[PDB]
Amino acid sequence: SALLTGKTFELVPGDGEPRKEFVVVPGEKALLHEPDVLTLTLTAPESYGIDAGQPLILHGVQVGQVIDRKLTSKGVTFTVAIEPQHRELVKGDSKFVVNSGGIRILPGDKGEMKASYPLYANLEKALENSL
Amino acid sequence: VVIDVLIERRFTDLVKKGSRFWNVSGVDANVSISGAKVKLESLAALVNGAIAFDSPEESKPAEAEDTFGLYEDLAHSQRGVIIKLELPSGAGLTADSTPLMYQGLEVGQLTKLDLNPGGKVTGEMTVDPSVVTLLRENTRIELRNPKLSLSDANLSALLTGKTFELVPGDGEPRKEFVVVPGEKALLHEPDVLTLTLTAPESYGIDAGQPLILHGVQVGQVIDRKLTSKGVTFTVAIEPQHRELVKGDSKFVVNSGGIRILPGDKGEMKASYPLYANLEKALENSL
């Protein structure tokens, strides 16, 4: 039955002053317009096949999502959204690895969220950075 | 035939010289899937037929014995600019009910679909007067097929069959276009790199296969051509990534598609050789 309806809207309520005009999110670019969400920027020489809809992984758990790639002379640049419920887990010095799809997070201890984090290749290059 | 309509005295201000009469007659029972809706309101029109007309607000009133043309229905009477298309081959196209979508909103339709003597299939499309300003020199009109897209599956769009898509642009206003075959599009974009690659074999690289730069989709192969001097591909680099490939950059059989090894400053040559895997491409510089 729902497959015949074609396409619908979904009302996700919230807090604040009453509103009367909205901006409908493109659906997949949602979770970027959530109230609290971590918007990180990753840089990489290549793309490693990581694409827009690919997920983020923390301890094997789906946590966030890649959102978009951007190709530039300085290599690929991903934008990444961490959900609010798992926001406090990634806390700065945590690193990012090409999961092997998606991006796997190596969480760290206390630290301040930087502006952009480098996306390493597999763990052999990520862990050696600290040593 | 010539019909003689007698508009009563107290209504003669309605018939303007730019009015349009359309036939409203019989029943128009339509049926679709989730939308097989039939509505009937006029009873006399169902029995002995009827005519209807409209009245613009800027044209002079019609004089006696003035001649108009009776359109087939309300749809055929719609105003809008008539543009001409040279479309490749009308296969999923119908003389009507083939829309011209612009951001998912229908802003026109096919109205004529002919077959010229030279085998060329031409057509004529009526466009809503709201988007005539978007019909300029660099505006493409692309045939588009509905994909499966198992995510959403567009059960409504898959019934429409095949549509046009208006990609606007800049320049002088235009009135006749050449509809791109859809996949040969991105070759007729305003700015695009058209490169020619040569290779002894084909390495399985085909027409629709992509180009790769740093793992990112950048361009597309377009066509192969077999010749005594080996396979020859033609390749289109998109404009946004045009300035990245800058000459001495090389091309490798990706392992599908063609993977670009970008280089530094250099002038774009006429044709680049398509190497085998990197072992032969990198050794060329050393």
Q: Are residues B172 and B196 in the same domain?
A: no
CA dihedral angle for residue B211, residue A77, residue B246, residue B181, rounded to 10 degrees? 40
Contact of B166 with B109, CB cutoff 8 Å: no
Report how far residue B141's alpha carbon sits from residue B164's, in angstroms, rounded to the nearest whole number. 6
Amino acid occupying residue B165: E
**Hey, CA dihedral for A90, A94, A95, A97, is it positive or negative?**
negative
Same domain, B86 and B175: yes
Burial track B164-176 (b if 16+ CB lie within 10 A, e otherwise): bbbbeeeeeeeee
Residue the block writes with tokens 């390495």: B203
Report chain B residues whose CB lies below 8 A from the CB of A48: 215
Provide the residue type at A113 as one letter: M
Q: What is residue B57's DSSP assignment?
A: S
DSSP B26-50: S------SS--------SHHHHH-E
Q: Pick the residue from chain B with its C-alpha nearest to A76.
A: B214
A4: nearest CB among B155, B241, B244: B155
Residues B213 and B234 in one domain: yes
**Which residue from B minimizes the CA distance to A50?**
B215
For A115, other C-beta atoms within 10 Å of its C-beta total 6
- State the Cα–Cα distance between residues B271 and B250, nearest whole angstrom: 11
Q: Which residue has the tokens 């290549």?
A: A46
Å resolution of this model?
A: 3.1
Q: Residue B58: which domain range?
A: 1-77
Q: Say yes or no: B260 contacts chain A, CB-CB below 8 A.
A: no
- Which residue in chain B is spatially nearest to A27 when comparing CA positions? B152
Classify residue B118 as exposed, middle or buried by CB count within 10 Å of its CB (0-12, 13-18, 19+): exposed
Cβ pairs A/B, distance under 8 A? 29
* Dihedral, B165, B168, B169, B173 alpha carbons, nearest 10: 110
CA angle, corner A125, sides to A122 and A129, nearest 5? 140
C-alpha distances out from residue A81 to A30, A48, A56, B12, Å: 10, 19, 9, 66
From the candidates A8, A28, A47, A119, which should be mutated to test the interface with B, based on the most B CB atoms within 10 A?
A47
Q: Which of B84, B77, B81 is nearest to B18 (CA)?
A: B77
Cβ pair A69:B216 closer than 8 A? yes
Regarding whether B63 and B127 lie in a shared domain, the answer is no
Q: CB of B125 within 8 A of CB of B111?
A: yes
Q: Does A110 touch chain B (CB under 8 A)?
A: no
Output the CA angle B107-B112-B115, nearest 5 degrees: 140
User: Is residue B175 domain-shared with residue B195, that is, in the same domain?
Assistant: no
Judge if B123 and B85 occupy the same domain.
yes
Reduced to 3 states (helix: H, G, I; strand: E, B; else coil), residue B144 is strand
Say which experimental method was used.
cryo-EM
C-alpha span between B177 and B63 (Å, rounded) = 39
- Per the DSSP assignment, residues forming a β-bridge with B143 are B164
Q: Which of A3, A69, A76 is the closest to B153 by Cβ? A: A3
Indicate left, alpha or beta for B203 from its phi (over 0: left) and psi (-120 to 50: alpha).
left
Q: What is the residue type of B28?
A: D
Residue A64 makes CB contacts below 8 A (sequence gap 6+) with A31, A38, A55, A56, A80, A81, A82, A83, A86
8 A C-beta contact, residue B90 and residue B121? yes
The two tokens of residue B52 are 């209807």
Structural domain ending residue among the three candidates B162, B185, B208: B185
Give, in degrees to the nearest 5, the angle at Cα A103 between A98 and A104: 85
- Interatomic CA distance for residues B78 and B68, integer angstroms: 15
Pick the residue from chain A with its C-alpha nearest to B263: A73
- Pick from B185, B206, B232: which residue ends a domain? B185
Which one, of B250, B205, B269, B260, lies nearest residue B231 by Cα? B205
Between CA A98 and CA B215 the distance in angstroms is 13
Q: Cα–Cα distance between A54 and A69 in angstroms, integer?
A: 11
CB B109 within 8 A of CB B126: yes
> Of B23, B182, B174, whose CA–CA distance to B93 is shortest?
B182
